[model samples]
Target: DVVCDVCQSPDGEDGNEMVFCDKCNICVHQACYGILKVPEGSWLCRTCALGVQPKCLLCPKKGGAMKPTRSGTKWVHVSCALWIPEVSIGSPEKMEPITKVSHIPSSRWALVCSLCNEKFGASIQCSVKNCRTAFHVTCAFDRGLEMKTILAEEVKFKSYCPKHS
Candidate 1:
């Protein structure tokens, strides 16, 4: 009269050593347990059977505890899933025009952070008093920075050159 836990078929000829989930009165063959390895003994069937929610697989928070999505099989937390798209897929291009800004002579021109800066390939600059700093665009954007137009020249120059001013 015993039936397979998966197919629920009485004709399922698996084995006598039935791994039973006493909580749900479900029974599966020992071999079947190898494939669908639930918890050790009787436990929450709905929580165990449903598995964890999908999230960003690349995020450091992702552990084996997370569940895999039905669509992409991507395992992660719901909140963590948002960060998955930001994952760097491949090695990024090197910053071009590597030159020193502070080393540049001030007599020729004001060596502002952007002006003397030769490399702005992926760099970022801000004018906010407390946040007047430069960072790689990739680095800044990833940190959830809201980019704002502070300099009038930013619109005039239509470029991010310190020399534009």
Candidate 2:
């Protein structure tokens, strides 16, 4: 079985998507390419371009959610980039209940952590694809999970929830 150099995943066995860089002769997930769309032809991973680590704009955290925009110049936490937008206030301009993920590319469809039921600065998805659930990073860790960040807004862990586990 072939393992991806970047993700260290056994992608060849699982059929997870990947791209092979001819120049560096390495394997990286398509998401790791950090582009909206993979180029049609031969491509090079960031290491080949002498790329540096990603830093989030809001939390300024490293090693997570460096979702590149269409321009690809600035990278931000998916929460900082995607969560703060898509909301409205009532007549008095009062904002209540932080946000609703009820849209594509959201931190979560709901603003509260699934476990704590509290507002979250950021959120991670349940590893299960159809669970349709979200939890704050801290909340997920409290339950003992080693998470994998697939995209800026997509962090997952294999551990099952209380109900499922």
Candidate 3:
């Protein structure tokens, strides 16, 4: 079965609507994307978006904004962060700001990548025990981060940010 990461729900529904992304995840819905203007690329529900960990400095409460700030310190958001692709019913946990967001999910409260506020697939989690961070492979590469997985627990396979590795 295909799961739409955008909505964090399966798309192939009878009384429901959905779409699939290149990674074979059915991550969006017609009305929700059209309503939220979720664009042509991939997406996931707020719940899963936070799971993917796309952090942005604009909204520290949660991640999802995809724009890099001009200062090169972190990503920001004006509208791009609002590009959510699903409705209240779309997410598995209905991560709808927790009814007031004062009820924020614990996962969304963590420190995310400074660039995109996201941790991606096949990424390098920071090797430093204190940092324990993860950045997308592309995001890490774009920033020219290096791998210093020299220790035993480091797996000798992961990379890290300038401050960690």
Candidate 4:
């Protein structure tokens, strides 16, 4: 279920191939993560090479693809902000400065996820037309939901429920 930290897409042919960091075990797409060329041997990202570990401000996890906040003082997992309905990245292409988190409605935070059977956190809905299924980010991945990365100039990601998928 690993995906690019930037594009939030699974691996593919062409330039969508993924590179894993030896240090943090994070996977990223060459083009999406701005890795112009693959290294010959073990690869380490800038943060890992510098021996720094940063926690995601949005979630209680570490060692994922992270981007600096608008203030450049905080970090958030790229995927964390993407799946949150109210959260938004300043520029989808750039994929930084995750904003609009404060706008997440209380209802979204209270809905119990059908997959995980938990509540009190933001969850995403199925993308199929008229489907109202909802689940948490990890729950969707664990349940094997279909996550499609539509490649284009803007690069988009979509998730579907098991029934719809």
Candidate 5:
């Protein structure tokens, strides 16, 4: 029943395989982790291999497919960084050095989560055309919102609340 640490999906798609980190035992999809090719041997996640398991700077959770900040001083989940409007991955293909999290507007950080009704940390807005609901990353997952990635010329991320979905 283990799901991808990033996308929180239990199944892998056509070319994307589920990969398990030998050291940390975390699960991730190759595409979700931006792994272009599966490694030939055992693999360790970035944090485990680096001997650092830092919490996500963008969320209140830990242990997902995380990449470092631009300054390498902090870490964040790929899924968490991908959803926020202001956050950007320096290199999408490599999916490293999450940048621009500081650029997120104070209004967004102030959003009260629809699922938990709290605003202590950052939250992501539902992608329904006109819905204004926002929820924490884990709250969305636990609440069963639809967070899906559309594979096309450009990878697109979308999430929707239950009512809208």
Candidate 6:
């Protein structure tokens, strides 16, 4: 029996008019709030509306471009698009196929990460302790691990963990 702040009446009286705003701590009437969408539990005040800017459901800090889904009720970021591994948002598949190479070449193709398959080019390779995987410059940095920058044959390359042997 909570009262709507805007309409000054309890819910279900005159068409379930009560809408509660957890942010502002105010209960408002549906008509008074003029909210086309009312989420479960309480609603936010005009000052505390959640949709003013599209927030990432996963990580809220990284504000990137957003696109509305077919449902029209939720918004998603462009950069964090790959976070949803099953939905198939941007590319045909999130991961690129791993092609094995017998011998590492100076500038030959190499395997990529299963998460974000950015190529290692000729500069960076993986270090998963016997895995010796490779990745792109940006991908290696994004992984947030300690790396060893090496110079072989006057060519500088970044190596990740598994290659210690």
* Candidate with maximal lDDT: 5
- List candidate 2 segments past 4 Å from native: 1-8, 13-27, 30-44, 47-50, 57-61, 64-67, 76-121, 125-165
Error of model 4, residue 79, in angstroms: 2.2
Any runs in candidate 1 off by more than 4 Å, and if so which? 9-16, 35-165
Ranked candidates, highest lDDT first: 5, 4, 2, 6, 3, 1
Model 1 residue 113 CA deviation (Å) reads 64
Query: For candidate 5, what is the lDDT?
Result: 0.81
Question: Who wins the TM-score comparison?
Answer: 5
Which residue runs of candidate 6 sit more than 4 Å off their true CA positions?
Answer: 13-17, 40-42, 50-165
Measured against the true structure, the TM-scores of the candidates, in listed sequence, are: 0.21, 0.34, 0.26, 0.66, 0.83, 0.25
Alpha-carbon deviation at 50 in model 2, angstroms: 6.0
lDDT for model 3, please: 0.40
The alpha-carbon lDDT assigned to residue 156 of candidate 6 equals 33
lDDT of 1 by residue, 69-122 (tens): 343344432222211223221111211111222232332222122322433222
lDDT of 5 by residue, 1-165 (tens): 889878777998777889899988999888777777888998878888889878776567666678898788788878778888789888877788799988988998888888888655689887877789888776687778888889887777788888877
The stretch of ten residues in a row with the least summed lDDT in candidate 5 is: 56-65
lDDT of 3 at 156: 45
TM-score of 5: 0.83
What local lDDT score does residue 28 receive in model 5, on the 0 to 100 scale?
A: 86
Question: Each model's C-alpha lDDT?
Answer: 0.33, 0.45, 0.40, 0.70, 0.81, 0.41
Clashing pairs in 1: 54-76, 55-76, 55-77, 115-162
Two-way TM-score contest, 1 vs 2, winner: 2
Listing every candidate in turn, what is its Cα RMSD in Å to the true structure after a full C-alpha superposition? 21.5, 11.3, 13.3, 4.2, 2.5, 19.2
Instruction: Report residue 44 deviation for candidate 6 (angstroms).
Output: 1.5
The positional error of residue 162 in candidate 1, measured at the CA in angstroms, is 75
Error of 6 at 42 (Å): 5.1
